[PDB]
Design a protein around this nucleic acid. Sequence first.
RNA 1: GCACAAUCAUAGCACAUAAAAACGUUAGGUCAAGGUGUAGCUUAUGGGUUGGAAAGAAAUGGGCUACAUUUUCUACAUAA
Lengths: 99, 101, 18, 194, 164, 138, 120, 132
Amino acid sequence: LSEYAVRMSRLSARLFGEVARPTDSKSMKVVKLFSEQPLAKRKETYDWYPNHNTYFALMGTLRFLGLYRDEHQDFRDEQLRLKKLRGKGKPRKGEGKRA
Amino acid sequence: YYVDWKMLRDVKRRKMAYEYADERLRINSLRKNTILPKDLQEVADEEIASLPRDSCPVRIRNRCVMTSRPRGVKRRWRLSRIVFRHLADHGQLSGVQRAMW
Amino acid sequence: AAAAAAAAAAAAAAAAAA
Amino acid sequence: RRKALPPRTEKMAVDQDWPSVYPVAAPFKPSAVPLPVRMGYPVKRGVPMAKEGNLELLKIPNFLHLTPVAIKRHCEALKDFCTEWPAALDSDEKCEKHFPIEIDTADYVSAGPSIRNPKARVVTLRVKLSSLNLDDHAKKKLIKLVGDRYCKSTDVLTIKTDRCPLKRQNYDYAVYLLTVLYHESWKTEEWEKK
Amino acid sequence: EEVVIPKKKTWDKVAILQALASTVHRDSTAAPYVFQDDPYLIPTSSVESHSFLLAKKSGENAAKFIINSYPKYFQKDIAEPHIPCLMPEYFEPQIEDVSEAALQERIKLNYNFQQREQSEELEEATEADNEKSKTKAGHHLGVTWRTKNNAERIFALMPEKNAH
Amino acid sequence: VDVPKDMTKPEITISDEPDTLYKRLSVLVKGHDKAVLDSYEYFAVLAAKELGISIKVHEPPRKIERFTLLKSVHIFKKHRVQYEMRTLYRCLELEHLTGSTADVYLEYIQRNLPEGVAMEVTKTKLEQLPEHIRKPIW
Amino acid sequence: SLWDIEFAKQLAAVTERPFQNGFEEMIQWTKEGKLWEFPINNEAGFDDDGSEFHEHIFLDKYLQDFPKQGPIRHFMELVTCGLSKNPYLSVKQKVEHIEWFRNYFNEKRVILKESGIQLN
Amino acid sequence: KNRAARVRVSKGDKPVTYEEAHAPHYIAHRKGWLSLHTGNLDGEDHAAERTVEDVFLRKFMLGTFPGCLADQLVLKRRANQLEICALVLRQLPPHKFYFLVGYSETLLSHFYKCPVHLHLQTVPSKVVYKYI
RNA sequence: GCACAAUCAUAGCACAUAAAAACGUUAGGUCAAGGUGUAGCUUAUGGGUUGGAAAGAAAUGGGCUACAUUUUCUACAUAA
Ligand SMILES: [Mg+2]
Ligand SMILES: [Mg+2]
Ligand SMILES: [Mg+2]
Ligand SMILES: [Mg+2]
Ligand SMILES: [Mg+2]
Ligand SMILES: [Mg+2]
Ligand SMILES: [Mg+2]
Ligand SMILES: [Mg+2]
Ligand SMILES: [Mg+2]
């Protein structure tokens, strides 16, 4: 390590746009934090799960409008109808424990 | 609805992390440095602690998209190891085949 | 320690980098 | 009431132009293909399945719109949009003497709703230092200023820019880097005396 | 002096595609491209060909009506170029209190455009010769006594320009 | 017999700007199976021989990604299921191309590019020298 | 003028037709915006506000409201380098980050005076 | 015993298709992929974004064409436009088939912000490959 | 016809490996990948916030380090 070499490196850093003055490795964390995209802002992270609410709402609206025919929902409804006809349904809110 | 209440909470966690990602990104620059004095770093610690809990991306759990299984989920397909097989053996994913060598 | 002065705005105006 | 219409096979002419039936990509509809093709694993006593309702024939991509006849018919009309290549630059020796700078730019394609690919921002600039007007001390300074980006055995400097988002912005940054390096390689400062 | 650099040719986005379309002419034994090539769906007669297009359009406009009735299921944009034609439409005005802002939204989206005129005139608001022209055009495009009632609203209320 | 007449009507103009030159146009086509890649290679060769491109085609090495998962649902680790993803590569090396020629070629290629393959285009844009480097003195 | 649109729709009524060829099916979608622009370039539709490299890399113009010889410049040079090495964010977002740091340091004046280093 | 995508052997009267008649270890050997895209390549991305849209369409078409759909879908993904090939029985009238195809090509395109093509092939019955 | 076999994959054969192994026994494991019939909750066996989910009297399964001289350290492809 020589003075000519350290001046050449200081000029090379200034020209390339890096950190010119000497800094410890611990101070490069704040450099990397802005040089790279944060975790919470990545698309693969913030858009992990699609809109299951939109999926269910669209499917149910189509089913009620008469375009989609959900066999699983029809099975659930048929089983609930048979259960209520047998005599064991869903109690009204507020009369399950007291009444 | 969603798959599970756990997935519903994880969606809100991701949303709050995306909402407060900028504030934490700006505050951590005051803590992860050694040039600025520690007097302001100790205050920045309290400031970032005063943030809501779900704002940090650390509470984000990488679950499945189909069944929301908390473990055994690939990161590239975002699917559980079982739903991935149930789809690959059906052939709805290109290039996937039984490894034979 | 010692710091060398770098012509930033001058180089920018010379190479159309301002 | 069910109606059964015969396919185009009984009406296909033996001298009919095939690109007229299959100009673009099609899902290989068996009603317009007069060729009896059998695809599928046969049975111990059976034969491969027919073309009607064969799922394996729809699974595979079809090149029926890219037969050599259609290839020639399309390439004949494409002679109007292209230009002539200069025959005086067939050998790379004169290409290096005339246009010494090489600009490597990456471009990717993918089927889907998204087009943005973060791998497309990189721009490479390769410059042969034997085609410039650097003096001895200027070259010796440029070597130590660029560092490992200059191959001493190949005598080529490679600048790989990825800091700018846009490819044109990276190209402008690369040409600015080349300009500022060529300018700074000549300035003899005070510290060069030691 | 030894280098040779020719000039480039600028074409349209679909010019080269029309150049390829000019290579292939109309087929003889082929059904029209709007119909499906399957024999069970190929139109047999002229009435069937006239009915299948209407049947397909009755599904197209039905899906468009569903999109217009539920825009929240299509607000999420995935495509990078952000194609606006695949976005849901909105038939409601932006402001309901400002009469000058409601007129400009009701002239472009019959009965509501006429009711906005009364809602604007009830507040003793002076309307210029620019909004009234479009308000009268919105009625002259769609639509006897109401015609005279609106034509008197052109001169008796404000001296609307003869050019309008 | 009934052929349409006057079917040609293009919009081609000659701009005064000098066309850009290219040294090497590399096309890396990745796919799953080899039959589609061979058909695409034949198609590209046929499309290049008509235009006079002199395409050099070699087959880059393949890349196979294998990953192991469990076989059963709840608890069986001694038994596994291994899945494989192959990626076969094709290298189309074009040389001595111009701007308009490269544009029309890439258009005619990407219009008919199959669905099961992807393509990476690497361009060698030719340029002599910028204006501030020819013979400047600071 | 609504009459101009009335004439335009009457022109389109005789102009448009059901597609008779897959080539026309692609031409219409390309003219409308559904199909991509060929050759496929990964930057179609994104201009980044017409900015250049001097608006992204050279960000020293925004650090004038800071002490030059203090540790504030030593801290902000790292942020400037990180923002210049970030092709993901635009120019306005980096300006907003710089302004956030400016107003934070200008609001917290007692801590810098207590630390022992004179800052303005 | 492996059960994944494997239909068991009955007494000898059940009709099975060419797809179900092959065990999962025959993918890319005798039977091909039902979906084609670029996300499942080596140096490519967007593997889950296409997979979720694939499963959504697998369910959507099954709910849209109930009882008349013979086999699984063929989902091609080629240059920003996705093709859906279906083998449907000719149970529904052609007017009802055209209504549904015109509704789908206008709903799914606006729902996924990408052009969709829907091709239908009418079969008289389920094509049986093995014993029936 | 289903198993076996052959064929296929480990980019040339053969070999080996891989892969495959029907019908069934163990009322074998999985209601906690996921949906589920039956039987039970609805001011709670439901939905949220915060804090803790120790520890070892003792036994045991499987791996790593070794108990050295064919060893340990040093530079080093293996003659110190
Ligand atoms: Mg559940
Ligand atoms: Mg065998
Ligand atoms: Mg072999
Ligand atoms: Mg053997
Ligand atoms: Mg085995
Ligand atoms: Mg038991
Ligand atoms: Mg046991
Ligand atoms: Mg339990
Ligand atoms: Mg359950």
